[PDB]
Subunit: 161 residues, 3 copies
């Protein structure tokens, strides 16, 4: 079994629904950690203090689903925070949490460079954030048009030149 | 054999070329359903009435390639139409075709969307449409820099927490 | 025993493609540094082991001259090169075709770092649309010419070539 899963994909790719289905199959006590501004599911708000909330609510009998990382970074960005320390803190939290967690996050770097400095800083922070999370998490799935593809665990390619 | 293929990926990723290649190996009579407003291939235009055209023109003697779902959704959005009805109709049709169809569609959710309500609406609509076409079609392929990866059929990843 | 090409079935060419801040640049380094060759950065933007050569526009010319059996060139990166040509008003089709023909016919190994820019909504201007079309087209031709293609997502590399592409029978 795994401690941590990162689910990454485009906007409106069905990643939430995928994270939901993996969580329900765990037959553990299910918490939605909601970041945006049935009865087996407890909803907990975490608009800004995501790491603090995760450390508060995590326990071995619970599975927390963060829905979602991108709207948490949007909250921090608009509040004026430096996104780097909280991203780095979140990666430490994901590596050593006292209960299982699924993180839902968006790919935002696969379009044209934004014509707006905040959009660029956001694109960079979200890209760094997914790299840190993927490295810290036991498993990573890409979700494309509702279909999940595992990309960790799995060996990295090695090429000879 | 399969009845339905979705070819998804970024813009100018070689999706059309891949759909055309799968079509030409089929030995059926080949029809291009062209949604864009300005050999062994018949062209039939369907700027708006795509689900209608598919119910009427699909048949066991033919293979239709829809080129492409993104411009059809765009055509509707800019005409003023509500997008949820045509999308749910397309997905219903896609599950019940008279003969083989390949859907070409764009990923539009892996960037930073323009800050305008029309762009957000388009992104949400295109994303739910690809999820519904992926669910309805027998097979799905992601095309990356001209190279196709099959993601359906295939066993969905499972995890123990 | 059976034929395996000399040097442990090596590659001469690798395309690394991913979004902005996907970790593609640092995967390209890990690969370059396991090669044992003299490592050259071909910088397109206008360390002890790394030589740097700048090629803001003449990327084709520069690869042809500088590639050698004992060198590994890393092109960082295809997207700024293309951006450099677009802003100068150059026809993009000929240099793209010239670059993939160069990649197929190289005297020394080369890694190409390139961006995916085609998976969002393009701003409503003809220059953004032109760049999206050229970069998509350019990644298609490089992918076809290169021995190996890696997609890097959230700093995790997936090999998509070499490998059999799927076929669908109707």
């Amino acid at each position: 079994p795994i401690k941590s899963l990162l689910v990454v994909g485009g906007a409106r790719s069905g990643k939430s629904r995928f994270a939901q289905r993996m969580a329900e199959a765990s037959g553990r006590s299910l918490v939605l950690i909601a970041t945006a501004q049935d009865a087996r599911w407890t909803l907990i708000e975490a608009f800004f203090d995501l790491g603090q909330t995760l450390r508060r609510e995590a326990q071995p009998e619970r599975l927390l689903v963060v829905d979602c990382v991108t709207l948490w970074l949007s909250n921090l960005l608009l509040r004026g925070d430096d996104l780097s320390p909280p991203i780095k803190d979140l990666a430490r939290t994901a590596a050593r949490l006292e209960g299982p967690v699924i993180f839902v996050s968006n790919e935002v770097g696969a379009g044209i460079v934004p014509d707006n400095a905040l959009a660029r800083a956001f694109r960079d922070a979200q890209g760094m954030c997914n790299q840190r999370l993927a490295e810290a998490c036991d498993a990573v799935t890409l979700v494309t048009a509702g279909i999940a593809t595992q990309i960790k665990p799995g060996p990295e390619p090695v090429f000879r030149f």
